[PDB]
Design a protein around this ligand. Structure first.
Ligand SMILES: CC[C@H](C)[C@H](NC(=O)[C@H]1[C@H](C(=O)NC)[C@@H]1c1ccc(OP(=O)(O)O)cc1)C(=O)N[C@@H](CC(N)=O)C(N)=O
Length: 101
């Protein structure tokens, strides 16, 4: 039960920035469908005064990744990154956006 609070579909990059900058917690994120690369996904994460963007890559076997570790789904990529940093230079952990029912 309950849909994932992180899939925003074709929400533009600048609109993801605007929405996430208003979030209080560092790590508040969303997965969006890219406009610069049709058919691809992008990860937008809040961290301080910035909203960082990551490109969700896909190999020949259809597995998703950001760096080296491969995942069979976007769901597994997201979940893994809730406890392992999405960034190499900084320690950024993904946590669901604060939504009101
Ligand atoms: C500071 C946040 C990241 C640590 C940084 N982001 C970056 O290097 C982002 C660059 C960027 O944002 N250039 C403008 C690239 C990007 C480019 C396009 C995107 O899709 P759309 O166009 O926003 O829908 C998403 C990310 C990075 O090292 N990313 C790695 C890992 C990754 N998979 O993005 C990379 N560039 O391979």
């Amino acid at each position: 039960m309950k849909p994932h609070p992180w899939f925003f579909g074709k929400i533009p990059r600048a609109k993801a920035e605007e929405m996430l900058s208003k979030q209080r917690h560092d790590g508040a994120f969303l997965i969006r469908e890219s406009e610069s690369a049709p058919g691809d996904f992008s990860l937008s994460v809040k961290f301080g005064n910035d909203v960082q963007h990551f490109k969700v890559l896909r190999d020949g076997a259809g597995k998703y990744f950001l760096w080296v570790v491969k995942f069979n789904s976007l769901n597994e990529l997201v979940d893994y990154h809730r406890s392992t940093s999405v960034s190499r230079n900084q320690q950024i952990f993904l946590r669901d956006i604060e939504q009101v029912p």
